[PDB]
Amino acid sequence: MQIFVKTLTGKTITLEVEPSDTIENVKAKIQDKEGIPPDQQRLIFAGKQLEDGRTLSDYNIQKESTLHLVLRL
Amino acid sequence: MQIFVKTLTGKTITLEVEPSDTIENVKAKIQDKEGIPPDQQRLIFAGKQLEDGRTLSDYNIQKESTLHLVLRLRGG
Amino acid sequence: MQIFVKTLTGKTITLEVEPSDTIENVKAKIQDKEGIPPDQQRLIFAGKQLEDGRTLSDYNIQKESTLHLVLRL
Amino acid sequence: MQIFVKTLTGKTITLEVEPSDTIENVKAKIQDKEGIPPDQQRLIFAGKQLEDGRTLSDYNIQKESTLHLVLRL
Amino acid sequence: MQIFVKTLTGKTITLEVEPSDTIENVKAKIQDKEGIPPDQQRLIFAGKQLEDGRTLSDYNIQKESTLHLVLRLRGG
Amino acid sequence: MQIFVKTLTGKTITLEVEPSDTIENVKAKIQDKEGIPPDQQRLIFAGKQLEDGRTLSDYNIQKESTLHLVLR
Amino acid sequence: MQIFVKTLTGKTITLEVEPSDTIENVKAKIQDKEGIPPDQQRLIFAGKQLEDGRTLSDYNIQKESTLHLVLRLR
Amino acid sequence: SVYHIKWIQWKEENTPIITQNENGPAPLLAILNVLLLAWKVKLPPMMEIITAEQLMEYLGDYMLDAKPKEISEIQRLNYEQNMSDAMAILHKLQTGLDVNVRFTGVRVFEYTPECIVFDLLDIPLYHGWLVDPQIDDIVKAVGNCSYNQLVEKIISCKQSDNSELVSEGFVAEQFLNNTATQLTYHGLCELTSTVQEGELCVFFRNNHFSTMTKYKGQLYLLVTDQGFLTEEKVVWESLHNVDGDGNFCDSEFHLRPPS
Amino acid sequence: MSVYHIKWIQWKEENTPIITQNENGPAPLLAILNVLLLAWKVKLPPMMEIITAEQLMEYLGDYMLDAKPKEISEIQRLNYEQNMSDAMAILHKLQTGLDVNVRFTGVRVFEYTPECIVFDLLDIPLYHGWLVDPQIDDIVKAVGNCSYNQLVEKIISCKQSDNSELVSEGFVAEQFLNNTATQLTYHGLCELTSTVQEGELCVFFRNNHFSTMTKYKGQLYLLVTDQGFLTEEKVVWESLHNVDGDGNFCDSEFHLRPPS
Ligand SMILES: [K+]
Ligand SMILES: [K+]
Ligand SMILES: [K+]
Ligand SMILES: [K+]
């Protein structure tokens, strides 16, 4: 499954994920792509922040959904 | 229906509910017996965390089923 | 299990308790040895007050833990 | 079974012991009569120092034997 | 005769001794096979520590018996 | 298991070792990764020199331990 | 009487003396063999420091007994 | 809610600390006592009590007055979003703050919105709930799991058919029971060496937030309970064991004699 | 017999010598004397670059006699003389290795053996950090108040028992000795940091080695005494803050050494 994460800068990253993937693995995939470490990441979907231990399917994040990435600095 | 809620300390709580109560309402019944704030409550069943908007039937929770109550670490 | 409570005057009291004991019960066990009524007792562990309605297990009080005893106002 | 413990000055005390008693135990029995902590005691028999974990029988200490106690400061 | 010495290093050593061998000579034979100095060695048999002045007969150590070799803590 | 070897320059070399390895086998693993020959390596742990002929087990070297490396 | 003077490093020397000798004469006889200045010499017996003006008989030093030698280095 | 103020002689200056009664407002008092002891927030010296609304008005005023004026466009937008999310959560500081620790480091928490309040004030957040690395059984069972993940792993492992996972859950459960005060001796070590001298920071332990500091290499916790309000010489408690048997010290970190 | 190189460092603004180690063995003698040298109670000629074991042994024994205590009753004097003789008799073992028997309940808790007398007569505290974690009641019960010498005997006895409780007590006590093989635990580090006084010079037993220990600004440091660092003027003290042996090297004024 393909989902997008969008930063406040506007840069959009495409990720190939599974529904059973946890948010921790999603943050690890952004770690491998954009270089941002996971504990300096905030992902938002539908206005709520996503917990590391939950999965995309726990938030009903399905095909072609757009996540919002807020950075920590 | 009657379901059981097990804590990490080993205690088992009996709750009288229905298949149609929301998870938020089940947490309110736990608060009435244990005083635990619902926002601090995390219920686990079949390896899934029960979300407050859904109902017990959404998670296929049966009669005499056992839910696991773990708490968020709340600093006070 | 046994726990200790320490006053500001330096006195150390040894109590026999159970994790399921409420703080009101441990204050009653203090009264049995010192005579201070639970209405005058304030119990502190690790800087946090032990509220009379909760239990020892609620505060994770381990065996041989030292609690601090002060009079309230 | 009774053995004697003599100080360097010459003071002799009697202890009720068993051939299976460790010398830690007889050091504690000396503490009961004479008040020295066991870790401030040094017991000598047949010209050699006795080890805390051994028993009286390991060193062949028989009845009416005399141990020598040396203090530390 | 032949006896076994079990170490805490996970190995069992075979020794050629005689009943008249002093405990020190047994430790010297351990020094020749494992390099441990004799005064650092502590030999355990029957839950008893074999003292240096005695011989193997005094502890009734017969053939194919197993001693346990534990070391003192030597700082260096 | 893996252990770390830190030099006076701040460089840290990660080594894959076993408790049964001798100190010479550790100095040769340093030579396979670093340019220093075993004849020029001196290895220290907790202030004590790790002498040639001994094993890592003789010095109780645990996993994720840091050894110090300096000229012979 | 036969006395033995041993240092901590392990050098033990046998000396011939009498019980009526004083400790000054004892370290003077040790200087006669090893060549050690006597005021750089400290003599121990039974864990007790030996005074210059006392005798071997005052400390009850017996035959075939060992005295310990400590050198007063700079 | 009203809080009593305790005036202490802190670094030879009349300094106030906020003092707690009922359980709940420790997050708000831990943050503000860091700011008060740091003289970043100053209270009129006549005040004896203060309400929560004033406390957070002082807090919100400081966060806006501490905005980094020289920041890139990427920093401004992210600060902007983090600020907004932090205020929507700010009310929780007065009732209790949810944390999710990991057991691999004193600074390691899940980056939840409850952590933003500390980042925006440059206030470090610490815990001492660390695994003992010498026990490889616990290191494997606990792993890089957060607390929230670990309890779920214990739930799932107890019903597994894999014998290894069943044992992993048992060890993880034992670890959570043995270390229930949320402080271990490995954690106490790492804290003592990670916290800098004189650093004012927040310490999470046993579902509580404390204002922590280090003085001459020893860690101390500000005494914030109303029981010690009139005790001039009970200002800091030393943190040198897990039993809670700390030493009470005056505002100059000198041991309070029994009285 | 054996020679040791001397390192001259700036200790409390004064040129002070410390003894350096090459081969394994002499750590007990060097840890004791490096305490005396850092305390300026034993002083060497300012030029000496290298010293043999004999002068170190004589310098030490010379100080033991000059450190005779006053205000001692005849009971204390008799017990002192017996202790002084036995300590001198075993003094040679300082350069080959000293036998220690710890108990795992306190940083100052050893068996009072004659090799402890040397530290008593010099008032040099002896420490270890081999402590049981009190939050694990399994190990606290299994190890109890056993010394090391007793615990290995308990493990051997328990490993062949038919009592299910005893076999588990031995298995746990065996697990403890293997997990904590470097003879330092994090509970020991915490008790050491809070027990050692600021500025105190003492001796530290760890991983079959003796180190000179002190505390500065609340941090424990170990005196660097290996000859690999003999020419490193900036490597004098090593911080003790973990069981990994990954300490921070510091100069003679406890300032961090820059990587070069
Ligand atoms: K005697
Ligand atoms: K001010
Ligand atoms: K002023
Ligand atoms: K035993």
Numbering used by the authors:
A (entry chain F), C (entry chain E), D (entry chain G): 1 to 73
B (entry chain C), E (entry chain D): 1 to 76
F (entry chain H): 1 to 72
G (entry chain I): 1 to 74
H (entry chain B): 241 to 499
I (entry chain A): 240 to 499
Could you share sentences copied from the article?
MINDY1 and MINDY2 are members of the MINDY family of deubiquitinases (DUBs) that have exquisite specificity for cleaving K48-polyUb, yet we have a poor understanding of their catalytic mechanism. The activity of MINDY1/2 is inhibited by the Cys-loop, and we find that substrate interaction relieves autoinhibition to activate these DUBs. We also find that MINDY1/2 use a non-canonical catalytic triad composed of Cys-His-Thr.
When bound to MINDY1/2, the K48-linked chain adopts an extended conformation that lacks interchain Ub-Ub interactions. The only significant change is in the Cys loop that undergoes significant remodeling, during which several hydrogen bonds are broken, accompanied by the formation of new bonds. However, the binding of Ubprox brings H448 closer to the catalytic C266 to form a productive active site. The SAXS data of the MINDY2C266A:K48-Ub2 complex were analyzed for the presence of complexes with distinguishable Ub2 binding positions with OLIGOMER (Konarev et al., 2003). The best fit was obtained for a mixture of two different binding modes: productive (∼15%), where Ub moieties are bound in the S1 and S1′ sites, and unproductive (∼85%), where they are bound in the S1 and S3′ sites. The higher prevalence of Ub binding in the unproductive mode possibly explains the inefficient cleavage of K48-Ub2 by MINDY1 and MINDY2. To our knowledge, these structures of MINDY1/2 represent the first crystal structures of any DUB in complex with K48-linked Ub chains.
